[PDB]
Amino acid sequence: NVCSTWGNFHYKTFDGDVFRFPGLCDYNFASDCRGSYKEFAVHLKRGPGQAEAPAGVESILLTIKDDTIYLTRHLAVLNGAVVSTPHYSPGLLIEKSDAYTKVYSRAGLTLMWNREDALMLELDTKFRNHTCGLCGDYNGLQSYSEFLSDGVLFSPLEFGNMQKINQPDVVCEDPEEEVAPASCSEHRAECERLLTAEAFADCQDLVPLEPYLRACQQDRCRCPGGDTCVCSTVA
């Protein structure tokens, strides 16, 4: 299926489970914890904090079984060399459109990233019961082991904290537990009206609605003023 991340630090695993982890240092977005041989690993790197509304990404590291791709805002590097996109190696395709950057692999990996905030990854069915990154496992269970492993219901922040990567030159502090804000249910009508418009007719049966509107709930109240933070969800 698809793991996704967008908006004001909104995440979505392979089994739904939309939450919010405002980490900023570095994290293991996805990986192959088969144990014998690691086929691939996607590492995400947030920014230093762009502003209150947006939440960008600095660069992405993506290793597939022999080679590393380092994608930045302006350039893409393969094995330490700058490549003029597109590239057509016999086991890997990189292309750079204006609205997206796309990477296709023969192992069953597809990555699509717009250079600002939105990122999504698609894997085949081969990697079920093996993924171990921030996107949770890929067993198809809805929040089964991602948050309730040994009976303890993990809060999103602590679950995200465990997925950190230690860079042996810089110490980065994890975010502290914020005071539980009020359930922003006062803006539910606005989110429902905006999302369930006419232009979104033939997908009311393809994608659910509850998670994406719940995401709009916090987005609307956490992001006062400009509507740069609500229209990044309906996107």
């Binding site: 690691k38 590291l61 290793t63 590393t68 990567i165 860079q167 042996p168 030159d169």
Partner: protein
């Protein structure tokens, strides 16, 4: 004055470094873990096996750091250059 009268993970101390893996029950082993397992002080412990990998290939973010500093040992101008 104790040449050949010691046994353990530190060898026999007789001048030859080929019989160092000589177990306490005759023949010589081939790997480093096979010989070591025979000197456990607690019967309940399990047996280990060698590890055919290099850590500098699994932790890429650390490879540059490790190199940039450990390479100082070969720099003649550095204080270690004297040795």
């Amino acid at each position: 004055a104790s040449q050949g009268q010691v046994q353990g993970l530190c060898g026999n101390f007789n001048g030859l470094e080929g019989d160092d893996f000589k177990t306490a029950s005759g023949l010589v082993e081939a790997t480093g873990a096979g010989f070591a397992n025979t000197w456990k002080a607690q019967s309940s412990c399990h047996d280990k096996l060698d590890w055919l990998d290099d850590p500098c290939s699994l932790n890429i973010e650390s490879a540059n750091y490790a190199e940039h500093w450990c390479s100082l040992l070969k720099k003649t101008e550095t204080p270690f250059g004297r040795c």
